[PDB]
């Protein structure tokens, strides 16, 4: 397997999705990690705090996933710029640059 740069992309995407769904399993300092238990056991005036904590934790986990996606997209954009430059300079023409 000399194609260790393409399998790494799939592995990194899968590892980011795992990490996201593992953060989603946390209860973020609430009585339950599922919204249905909070709605079933608590009336809305005191359930709203639990709802806000759980939804805020989920949204912060999604935000961290988004920032990881910016890092991965920046690395992939650098690789794609290199690939496009090599396509335009070496596939479509001749390059005098060494290596």
């Amino acid at each position: 397997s000399a194609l260790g740069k393409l399998q790494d992309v799939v592995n990194q995407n899968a590892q980011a999705l795992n990490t996201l769904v593992k953060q989603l399993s946390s209860n973020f300092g609430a009585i339950s990690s599922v919204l249905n238990d909070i709605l079933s056991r608590l009336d809305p005036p005191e359930a709203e705090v639990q709802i806000d904590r759980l939804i805020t934790g989920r949204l912060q986990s999604l935000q961290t996933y988004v920032t990881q996606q910016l890092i991965r997209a920046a690395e992939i954009r650098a690789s794609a710029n290199l690939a496009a430059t090599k396509m335009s300079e070496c596939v479509l023409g001749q390059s005098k640059r060494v290596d």
Partner: protein
């Protein structure tokens, strides 16, 4: 105890009712009257006190006798055991936001 004692020295009978909510099959329930089961439709549902909104489908999952609820990711209840008929129904969210 004496009948001429003060209010803070008067007898007080205490009953502490300890529960456990939405984790095991339930043997004691509330005064709410059960209704019919509407399958494959979006409906507000209440299974053993678990309230929610969504659609239900028949599931091929198998539950152990001490299990009542099902969660793959532990923030949403996938499957429940219907209390009257022992079939297992899995719950899909009513929201089709993939449009």
């Amino acid at each position: 105890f004496q009948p001429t004692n003060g209010v803070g020295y008067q007898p007080y009978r205490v009953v502490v009712l300890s529960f456990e909510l939405l984790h095991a099959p339930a043997t004691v329930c509330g005064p709410k009257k059960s209704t019919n089961l509407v399958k494959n439709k979006c409906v507000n549902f209440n299974f053993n006190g678990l309230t929610g909104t969504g659609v239900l489908t028949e599931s091929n999952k198998k539950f152990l006798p001490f299990q009542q609820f099902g969660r793959d990711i532990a923030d949403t209840t996938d499957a429940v055991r219907d209390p009257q008929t022992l079939e297992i129904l899995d719950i899909t969210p009513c929201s089709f936001g993939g449009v």
